[PDB]
Structure formats: structure tokens, C-alpha cells
Design a protein around this ligand. Structure first.
Ligand code: D16
Ligand code: D16
Ligand code: UMP
Ligand code: UMP
Lengths: 287, 287
């Protein structure tokens, strides 16, 4: 049969394939996972659609506020908490920092993570309160320039994987790079994700890069195309198979759609008040 | 509809899918291409198999000598010419260098390309005859230590994409990063290739990373697993559609197998005389 939302059904079949074919391993601390290495899915973004899963609600406020935080170049977790978004709190507090040997680091200074690499790749990091203007490569600005002036390019790439800075990161990048692609006035985006928790993190990442593509599409005067999601270690955690069993038996509703309620002078000119999400209907929460 | 070599048949269907579903575009070199954005295939390396295409012969000597050249960390194209491997020759001679503004550069100094990034990521490049010992990150050594001591890691990654150094590269990286993966003593490798010419370059890259996986597996005392080949712009050139129509109608022979005829102290201890390729049978050349 045809499903109202085929793209999310395929995601459920991804989860289903992992449980059926994946290999059972104990990640390092004992905690087991079910894992397939090498997967790929595509999600249609046309007509403002954004792939926020309907069988299990996604922390939309987190996606939005975190992505703007990435774009701003910030590595200060405290700015995200001032928006009431706690995803980076445990990774930036005293205990977690000291455990990595960052005993001199202010609480919340996550190190040279995503935002720093996107906008200042190759720059000398010191802390999250340093003015890095004009230091390093502005990958996000270069991408936008390539899309506008060289739409046919096959090198429109933005990487967060900086071997020199990995040591000083509280967490190594998970979505390690993405590639953009223009075809018949439509902007597409492929994301390579080295590691993916299909129960929690992966749906969140789909929304982030789906939203990012919609933003870049508007800045470049293009229409949204397709999101290609490539996974390295696509895995489910053993202790959480019950929740996915429930999620899989649910028929997906239609994806919501993004709507930008004002114009923007650049990728840096977005604000939470003008990113609208319409008709996000989900199935009830899962214990 | 079974096949002696299923993995190569799927490749033929990849090319076929590109031709039937791909989008027709004119790239920055003129001359059109047929392209799909986002593809993925898997090739079995178990029991020493290496995916060297049989429907169209691959330049095995180029694969072998170039990969050893990469591993050595060399950026001097002249060493490859001393082995009779003339890829990278036109990219490193006077005309091409001056066209990019490297008017002060010695012939053959390809810049901070693959070899430099693999073994000295983040280091200050100057020329291809400089001792970079202790400079930058030795990603290839980091990967090997991770495989040995942390086989379950989801962060075993080696990237050739350095935004800081792109300007000084004669050619921007095409195979941009790879991720490794250990499961029950089997070593796998996923390659993300931003751009892929299915008629020439892609078959070569599959063998390169296939051989690389076989090599790293032996150093770490593991068995070869799976090669996951992810493509960004997977394309055929409109000029060569006639040739591929023939190639697609060919039944693949069995893949050849790699056999290492002596022990190795490290990934740096390999030589052409001890990498053997057994039973590589190909279909005849195509006009
Ligand atoms: C094992 C593991 N799986 C993950 O998916 C994961 C994700 C992150 C960061 N990340 C990419 C996240 C995205 C969304 C998140 C989250 O906590 N969502 C909750 C709401 C939390 C809140 O309201 O503050 C949820 O939707 O249930 S966490 C960090 C460690 C992880 N660890
Ligand atoms: C349009 C284009 N397609 C490619 O595949 C390509 C590949 C490279 C570099 N590369 C990744 C290569 C892999 C194999 C090669 C090659 O030329 N092989 C010869 C073998 C004959 C010989 O050199 O003796 C061949 O079969 O044409 S070249 C550079 C520019 C390109 N440009
Ligand atoms: O953006 C993210 C960050 C983390 N994770 C999940 C995947 C993992 O299993 C875990 C990260 O652990 P490591 O891969 O770093 O070991 O969190 C995601 O899915 N998306
Ligand atoms: O390792 C390589 C190097 C090059 N190419 C081919 C693919 C292309 O179409 C062309 C690269 O040109 P650009 O990606 O720079 O546009 O060469 C490969 O397939 N593999």
C-alpha cells in the first residue's frame, strides 16, 4: 500500500531492519546496542515540508534554538539554557568537564564544537567568550556563496570534524559533515552521521538539517529539495526496544511544514519568533 | 536472477538507476552529466575479496601504488611517476600550477593533499620535501590505535577535508572521509565520496578503500568485513552513455582476492612486492 507519509514509514523500516538484522554488541560500559553499519534514507522537503517524526514527538524547540546557536558560532552552553534548552547541560557542567581533564574550564564552555568549526574552522580556540571574528574559515558563508554563484558545484561541503580540536571538545561531532546540491532551482542536502540513536538523536538530527536546508534555501532564493541522511553506526539501545516496538505499530501522520514569516538579509538574520511550524500532529508520548 | 558476483551486479544497477532516474545537468566543465544526489552500495570484503570491477578493468597498479603513496604521507607527485603511475602528473606540472597561482612552487608539489592530511592534519604546509614529524594529527595512526584498543568506538574516522588547506591543493579531495567499524573481529569501512564518476573514478576508489581496509585489518589482527560506499553526486557523463550500455549487459565474473605474502610491523611497512592480487579476470576492453 501507499502510506500518507512514506518517508517516515521508511524510517520505521530502518528501525525494523536494525532490530531484525543488526549485530548485538556492548558499547563499552556494558550497555548493549543493536547496530547496522551503513544506512541511507531520503526525505522530501518540497513545499516547505520538514521531517519531524509523527510517531514520536521531537523536541522542536531544541532543534530550533540549538541550530540558531550553531549558526551564531557560539560554544557557550549557557546561552542555550537561557532559552530553557538543556540538551548540552550535562556535557558542560563541572563533573563532566573535570572527568575529561578540563579542570580549568568554565562551566558550559563546550570547547571548539560545531558552531566554532562551522564559522571559524582552523582557528585557535581558547574559550567560549573570545571574539573569533575574522579567524578561521567561515564554512557556512562559503557554502552560501557557492550555492548562489556556483550552483553546479560538487564541493559545497561543511565539516565539523577537526582532528586538531577533537581533544578539546566535550563531545566529538556526531553529524560530522554535510553536502549541498542544486538542481532545477531546488536545494538539497546530504548529511553524514557517524553515529545515530534511532530512538532519540536521529529524529532530532533530521529536523535540524531539514530546517537548516529550508533556511539556506530562503537565503539563496531557492526552493527546498531533498534531505539525504547517511548513517555510519545506525543503532538502537537494547534497554529501549520496548518503546520502538510501540512506535513501529503507529501509522505516521503527515509531516508539518516550515514557514518563515519575514525576510532575511543573511543566514545570520534569523530569530525564533519568525520560524513557524504548522500542523505538527504527533501520536501520544511513549513511556 | 541470481549472480555469481551480486555486489558488482548491484553496481551495474546503480549506473542503470542513474541513467533512468538521474537528472541531466551541465556542470562547470561543460559537457553534460546524468546525476543522482545520494546513493549507497555495500561490497563484501570477507575472505580476502576486493571489489575490482570485472565488467571494466581497473588500473590496479594505480590503486596499489597511489595508496602506498598516500600512506607514506607524501605530497610529491614525482615519486608516483618513478613507479610509472601517471595520475597526478598533469595536475602537478608547470602549466597547471601557474594557472592556480602557485607560480613559486616546484613541479610535482601537489600541496597539502591526502597524504599530508592523513598523517599531519592541521600542520603548516610549506612544500613536499619538508619533515613534518610530530606536526599535526596522525589520523591513520589514531584510527589503528582505536581499532586495536577501542574496537566498539563509533568515532573511528579519518578525513581528508581541511577547509584551511583547500586553497593550496591542486585538487580538492574527492573521497572526503571514511569511518571504520569493528564487529566480532571483522573490520568494516564506510567511505563518503562527494563526487563520483561511475565510469572511471568510482571503480578505482572502491578498490583503493577495499585494499586499505584489507591492510588495516591485517595490522590490527582482524578479518576484512564490508565496504560501504556512499556517494554525493553520483553521475555518468553524457559522452560515455554508449559504453555503459554495453558494460551493463555483461555478467560479472568473481572478484579477485588480496593476499599478503609476508608479515608487517605497521601500516607503514607495506610494499608492492608483498601485496598479491589473485584471479583478476576481466571482460575485454571497450572502444
Ligand atoms: C544515548 C544517547 N542518545 C541520544 O539520542 C543522545 C542525544 C544527545 C543530544 N541530542 C542530539 C539530543 C536531541 C534531543 C534530546 C532530548 O533530550 N530530547 C528530549 C527532550 C529534552 C528536553 O525537553 O530538554 C525528548 O524529546 O524526549 S538530546 C546527547 C546524548 C545522547 N545519548
Ligand atoms: C571526469 C573525470 N573522471 C574521473 O574519473 C577522474 C579521475 C581522476 C583521478 N583518478 C581517481 C583516477 C583514477 C584512475 C585514473 C586513470 O586515468 N586510469 C587510467 C588507467 C590507464 C593508465 O593510467 O595507464 C584509465 O583507465 O583511464 S584517473 C581525475 C580526474 C577525473 N576526471
Ligand atoms: O547529535 C547526536 C548526538 C548523539 N547521538 C547519540 C548516538 C549515540 O549512540 C550517542 C553518542 O555516543 P558516541 O557515538 O559518541 O559514542 O548519542 C545522536 O544520535 N545524535
Ligand atoms: O578520486 C576521484 C577523483 C575524481 N573523480 C571524478 C568525479 C568527477 O566528476 C571529477 C571531479 O570533479 P569535481 O568534483 O571537482 O567537480 O572527477 C572521481 O570519481 N574520483
Amino acid at each position: 500500500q501507499v502510506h500518507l507519509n512514506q518517508d517516515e514509514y521508511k524510517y520505521l523500516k530502518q528501525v525494523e531492519q536494525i532490530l531484525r538484522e543488526g549485530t548485538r554488541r556492548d558499547d563499552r560500559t556494558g550497555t548493549g546496542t543493536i547496530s547496522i553499519f551503513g544506512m541511507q534514507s531520503k526525505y522530501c522537503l518540497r513545499n516547505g515540508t520538514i521531517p519531524l517524526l509523527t510517531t514520536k514527538r521531537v523536541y522542536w524547540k531544541g532543534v530550533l534554538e540549538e541550530l540558531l546557536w550553531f549558526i551564531s558560532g557560539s560554544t557557550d552552553g549557557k546561552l542555550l539554557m537561557e532559552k530553557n534548552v538543556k540538551i548540552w547541560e550535562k556535557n558542560g557542567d563541572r563533573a563532566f568537564l573535570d572527568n575529561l581533564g578540563f579542570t580549568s574550564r568554565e562551566e558550559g564552555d563546550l570547547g571548539p564544537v560545531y558552531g566554532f568549526q562551522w564559522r571559524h574552522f582552523g582557528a585557535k580556540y581558547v574559550d567560549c567568550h573570545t571574539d573569533y571574528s575574522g579567524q578561521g574559515v567561515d564554512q557556512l558563508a562559503e557554502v552560501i556563496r557557492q550555492i548562489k554563484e556556483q550552483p553546479d558545484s560538487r564541493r559545497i561541503i561543511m565539516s565539523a570534524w577537526n582532528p586538531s580540536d577533537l581533544g578539546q571538545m566535550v563531545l566529538p561531532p556526531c553529524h560530522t559533515m554535510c553536502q549541498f546540491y542544486v538542481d532545477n532551482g531546488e536545494l538539497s542536502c546530504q548529511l553524514y552521521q557517524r553515529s545515530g540513536d534511532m530512538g532519540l538523536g536521529v529524529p532530532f538530527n533530521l529536523a535540524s538539517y531539514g530546517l537548516l536546508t529550508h533556511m539556506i534555501a530562503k537565503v539563496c532564493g531557492l526552493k527546498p529539495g531533498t534531505l539525504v541522511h547517511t548513517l555510519g553506526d545506525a543503532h538502537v539501545y537494547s534497554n529501549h526496544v520496548d518503546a520502538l516496538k510501540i512506535q513501529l505499530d503507529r501509522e505516521p501522520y503527515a509531516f508539518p511544514k516550515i514557514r518563515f514569516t519575514r525576510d532575511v538579509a543573511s543566514i545570520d538574520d534569523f530569530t525564533s519568533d519568525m520560524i513557524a511550524l504548522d500542523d505538527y500532529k504527533c501520536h501520544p508520548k511513549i513511556p
